[PDB]
């Protein structure tokens, strides 16, 4: 028992950390409808059911939600899949004619601006010699003046505008993220998971749990909850440059809609392409709105206050305040409802001061058609109008707040709803997963000999 003989064993269980290109997978729900009738339905493998997950033991692996891979890349995959969906769709290039435009003959007041502008203009039919005159309706955030005030679409000088095909529907669809043969997805099942550092009990899986990408700046809609404690996931909380993710347990039922009745209309732009505009608005004219249940909202904000008071000392004052500037899509949270995007404001919620010791809450919207999402320099897309009344019931699950850079000994640590980019919308979904590279062929000393 003194000689040391080298041996190498294949199949040794031992892994390392690595950066690698993961592998998508689509549920059979998206596959139920085929021939590209929906979004991201024919670009993934069917997901294998009944996985062979084994509850690991006596393993202490560390996570780091902020300095981890598999999250900076899924944004690239999402944006690439999104961009490739507009190549076979119509272009609006010959549309930017001088719109002779007026106000809808509504019973408006002085403050309540006309949110529909009735604009008429010229267009080129199939016969290239003749030009027709057509009329349509635009929202107030799609016309900028030039000089009976001539209007033009805001992003025409900015870049060419692409129209989304009516066949595709923007609704999120569940996705799965499996690893190519060789890797493993370490997920740790700790209850009070800070997110960084060691995590007690782990488990290796081959595919992720149901993940769905939802574009929403503040108050991420339709998300995944926490287990027992309303969690505040930003270890580095003292520095005020980084946002603070909050995930509270019981969901808040955000119930919104638009009650107008749009009438879709078709115009001929050329031999093969059609321009889908808004016809005549029938019925009543109102303002699209959202409701949140007051008791649930107040109780949830109380819980958030309780859990935030632990990271700043017991005796301190906390007061919220609405967003204080920025673009129209981070000043107030943006969400897609029914295939169209509401820029509905959120100053009726983040207004509560909590010293140390049901009437539905309504909040008004404004609707935009042409969008510049992800702030691509030169891509503006047009959202065709959706016919009728539109509605959606959603699950508010978290917050995205930013502290105030208070000097001296700021006690009333005011927070703001800080939307940031769309990456924090996903970082709360992929905090429990790390991608490990299996490294077989371990080396070990023992006693043996290969005789002859």
């Amino acid at each position: 028992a003194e000689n040391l003989w080298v041996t190498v064993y294949y199949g040794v269980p031992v892994w390392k950390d690595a950066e690698t290109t993961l592998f998508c997978a689509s549920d059979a729900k998206a596959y139920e409808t085929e021939k590209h009738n929906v979004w991201a339905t024919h670009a993934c493998v069917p997901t294998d059911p009944n996985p062979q997950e084994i509850h690991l033991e006596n393993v202490t692996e560390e996570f780091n939600m902020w300095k981890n891979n598999m999250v900076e890349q899924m944004h690239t995959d999402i944006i690439s899949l999104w961009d490739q969906s507009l190549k076979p769709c119509v272009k609006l290039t010959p549309l930017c004619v001088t719109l002779q435009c007026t106000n809808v003959t509504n019973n408006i007041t002085d403050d309540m601006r006309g949110e529909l502008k009735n604009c008429s203009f010229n267009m080129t039919t199939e016969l290239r010699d003749k030009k027709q005159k057509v009329y349509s309706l635009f929202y107030r955030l799609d016309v900028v003046q030039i000089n009976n005030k001539e209007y033009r679409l805001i992003n025409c000088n900015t870049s060419a505008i692409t129209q989304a095909c009516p066949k595709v529907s923007f609704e999120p669809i569940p996705i799965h993220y499996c690893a190519p043969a060789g890797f493993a997805i370490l997920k740790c099942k700790d209850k009070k998971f800070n997110g960084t550092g060691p995590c007690p009990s782990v488990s290796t899986v081959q595919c992720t749990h149901g993940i769905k990408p939802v574009v929403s700046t503040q108050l991420l809609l339709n998300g995944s909850l926490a287990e027992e404690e309303v969690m505040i996931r930003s270890e580095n909380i003292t520095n005020n440059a980084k946002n603070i993710l909050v995930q509270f347990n019981t969901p808040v039922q955000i119930n919104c809609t638009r009650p107008n009745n749009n009438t879709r209309k078709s115009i001929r732009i050329g031999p093969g392409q059609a321009f889908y505009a808004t016809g005549d608005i029938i019925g009543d004219i109102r303002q699209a709105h959202c409701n949140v249940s007051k008791a649930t909202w107040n109780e949830t904000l109380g819980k958030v206050v309780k859990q935030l008071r632990k990271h700043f000392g017991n005796n301190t004052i906390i007061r919220f305040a609405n967003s204080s500037g920025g673009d129209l899509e981070v000043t107030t949270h943006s969400f897609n409802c029914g295939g169209e995007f509401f820029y509905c404001n959120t100053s009726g919620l983040f207004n509560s001061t909590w010293i140390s010791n049901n009437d539905s809450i309504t909040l008004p919207c404004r609707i935009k058609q042409i969008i510049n999402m992800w702030q691509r320099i030169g891509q503006a897309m047009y959202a065709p109008p959706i016919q009728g009344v539109i509605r959606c019931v959603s699950n508010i699950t978290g917050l995205i707040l930013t502290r105030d850079g208070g000097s001296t000994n700021s006690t009333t640590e005011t927070f703001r709803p800080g939307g940031g980019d769309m990456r924090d919308n996903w970082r709360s979904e992929l905090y429990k997963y790390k991608v490990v590279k299996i490294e077989p062929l371990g080396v070990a000393p023992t006693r043996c000999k290969r005789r002859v």
Partner: antibody, heavy 126, light 98 residues
Framework: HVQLVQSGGGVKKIGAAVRISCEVS????????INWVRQAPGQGLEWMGW???????????????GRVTMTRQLSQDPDDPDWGTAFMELRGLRVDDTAVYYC?????????????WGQGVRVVVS | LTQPASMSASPGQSVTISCSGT????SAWFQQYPGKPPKLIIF???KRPSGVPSRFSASRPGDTASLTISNVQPEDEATYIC?????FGGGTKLTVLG
């Protein structure tokens, strides 16, 4: 390199709006929050907030809320996508803020602490 | 953050500057010429940028940040700024006699 310049100081009568421009190039402008630091003669530095040019995010101090606007302008054409201009409009200033304003920034990937600083626009009130 | 107003020194002397408070959240040291943009000279209490003489060193056993300098060069009179993330210290005027 890391090119950053300022413009638009001077002396103004009380009750008017001071515009201060900070123009930056030499690096991708999407990241690297602008931090607006004011330096009052006879005292150490004080901080009056910061701005983020991805979506014009702002984050003020406990004193300037309701008196400052930290606006931005990106580059419209993809010819030069890294030419940014952060504007700060200060309104209704009291007589006691004759100072020098710098538009600092931070390292690659973070925001604290400031490395690069600006020559600094000096503003006086009469 | 209650820094000393000013201090004097002579060439060849080593002096220590103490910053109070900072509640153990990592401080930084800025060197400033009068009417100029200070550039970072100490960050993370353990590193210095390229182009800085090695006579500068900093540490923080507790709340106070201690920055010690040796063999101070006669033309290194300046002002010193203490940084604690968002705040800024009181600064000090270091004058080297000749």
């Amino acid at each position: 390199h890391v090119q950053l310049v300022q413009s638009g100081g001077g002396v103004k009568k009380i009750g008017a709006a001071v515009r201060i421009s900070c123009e930056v190039s030499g690096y991708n402008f999407m990241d690297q929050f602008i931090n607006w630091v004011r330096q009052a003669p006879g005292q150490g530095l004080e901080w009056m907030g910061w701005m983020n040019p991805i979506y014009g995010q702002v984050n003020y101090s406990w004193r300037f809320q309701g008196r400052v606007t930290m606006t931005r302008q990106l580059s419209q054409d993809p010819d030069d996508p890294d030419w940014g201009t952060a504007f700060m409009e200060l309104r209704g200033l009291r007589v006691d803020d004759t100072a020098v304003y710098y538009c600092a920034r931070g390292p690659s990937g973070e925001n604290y602490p400031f490395h690069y600083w600006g020559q600094g626009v000096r503003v006086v009130v009469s | 953050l209650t820094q000393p107003a000013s201090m004097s020194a002579s060439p060849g002397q080593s002096v220590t500057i103490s910053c109070s408070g900072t509640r153990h959240i990592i401080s930084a040291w800025f060197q400033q010429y009068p009417g100029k943009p200070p550039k970072l000279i100490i960050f993370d209490d353990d590193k210095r940028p390229s182009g800085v003489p090695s006579r500068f060193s900093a540490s923080r056993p507790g709340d106070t940040a201690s920055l010690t300098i040796s063999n101070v060069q006669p033309e290194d009179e300046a002002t010193y700024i203490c940084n604690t993330y968002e705040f800024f210290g009181g600064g000090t005027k270091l004058t080297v006699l000749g």
